[PDB]
Amino acid sequence: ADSCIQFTRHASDVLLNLNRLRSRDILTDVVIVVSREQFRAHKTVLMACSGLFYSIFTDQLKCNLSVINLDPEINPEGFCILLDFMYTSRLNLREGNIMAVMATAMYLQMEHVVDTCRKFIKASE
Amino acid sequence: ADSCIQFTRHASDVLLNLNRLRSRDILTDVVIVVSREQFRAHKTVLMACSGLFYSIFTDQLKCNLSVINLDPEINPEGFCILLDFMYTSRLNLREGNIMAVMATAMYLQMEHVVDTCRKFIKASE
Amino acid sequence: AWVIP
Amino acid sequence: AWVIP
Numbered sequence A, B: 001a002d003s004c005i006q007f008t009r010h011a012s013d014v015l016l017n018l019n020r021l022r023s024r025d026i027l028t029d030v031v032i033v034v035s036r037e038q039f040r041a042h043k044t045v046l047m048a049c050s051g052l053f054y055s056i057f058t059d060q061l062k063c064n065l066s067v068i069n070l071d072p073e074i075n076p077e078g079f080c081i082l083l084d085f086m087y088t089s090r091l092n093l094r095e096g097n098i099m100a101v102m103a104t105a106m107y108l109q110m111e112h113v114v115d116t117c118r119k120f121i122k123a124s125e
Numbered sequence C, D: 001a002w003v004i005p
């Protein structure tokens, strides 16, 4: 209906509660392995944020996997920063991590993060 | 870190993509039964919105159930309106459904919805 | 909060 | 969109 009312803070409150579930390891259903590092997460949040995870978890065989191994060229800290962004909307972008974050966002198909990284790099040149 | 940047639309874009997954029945992991009606959903979204579902899916036995039967006094249309609110932030509140929506929100422990229902009822008296 | 979207 | 939160 076009007669709905909307609770402004709802989407951010949902995301905050999803991140609290992740911190407590509640209903996490996949482990993402990035070289020597493992990250537990919820497949639906990964799919909702990342074009790569959407393609992975909509595949009829990969949707059932409990472990996903990323390309060995992916930096674990870059992945950690992007996973935190997925669950919080906040990106810890710094001079020391921007190239790793941008490369990881290109691989994960997260265009808005790729865009802000390109803008910060261009401003320094 | 306190040096993060934030993407304003991220939380609403995540919620919009979760609702698209629900519409396509992608990675839904529970059926909620309300009398003769069945609703497929994602346990994590239900937990992130509802105090009742949080208690249910954090229980060591109930967390494993693929079907949850609600109290027979719960109205299916009221539940449908609240499930849509969980996935969209939009509440289809109307004169003809407000009492059912309020009773369902009290049962699901969704205090913000209970609050706006109380305010709309008080304004009509 | 609540608003008219 | 991006902002300083």
Ligand SMILES: CN(Cc1ccc2c(c1)OCO2)c1nc2c(cnn2C(C)(C)C)c(=O)[nH]1
Pocket (backbone or CB within 6 Å): A047, A048, A049, A050, A051, A052, A054, A055, A109, B017, B018, B020, B021
């Ligand atoms: C994060 N992703 C957007 C995206 C970006 C690049 C891609 C992509 C998907 O697949 C291949 O390249 C996304 N899209 C979703 C979801 C649900 N429905 N949809 C669409 C495709 C109907 C918009 C979802 O959960 N996530």
Ligand SMILES: CN(Cc1ccc2c(c1)OCO2)c1nc2c(cnn2C(C)(C)C)c(=O)[nH]1
Pocket (backbone or CB within 6 Å): A017, A018, A020, A021, B047, B048, B049, B050, B051, B052, B054, B055, B109
């Ligand atoms: C929706 N719910 C809030 C809520 C309201 C009334 C209740 C309740 C929980 O349990 C009993 O009565 C919620 N809380 C969460 C989640 C994760 N962590 N938390 C807290 C408890 C640490 C705030 C979550 O997913 N959802």
Ligand SMILES: [Cl-]
Pocket (backbone or CB within 6 Å): A049, A110, A111, A112, A113, A114
């Ligand atoms: Cl993005």
Ligand SMILES: [Cl-]
Pocket (backbone or CB within 6 Å): B049, B110, B111, B112, B113, B114
């Ligand atoms: Cl609520």
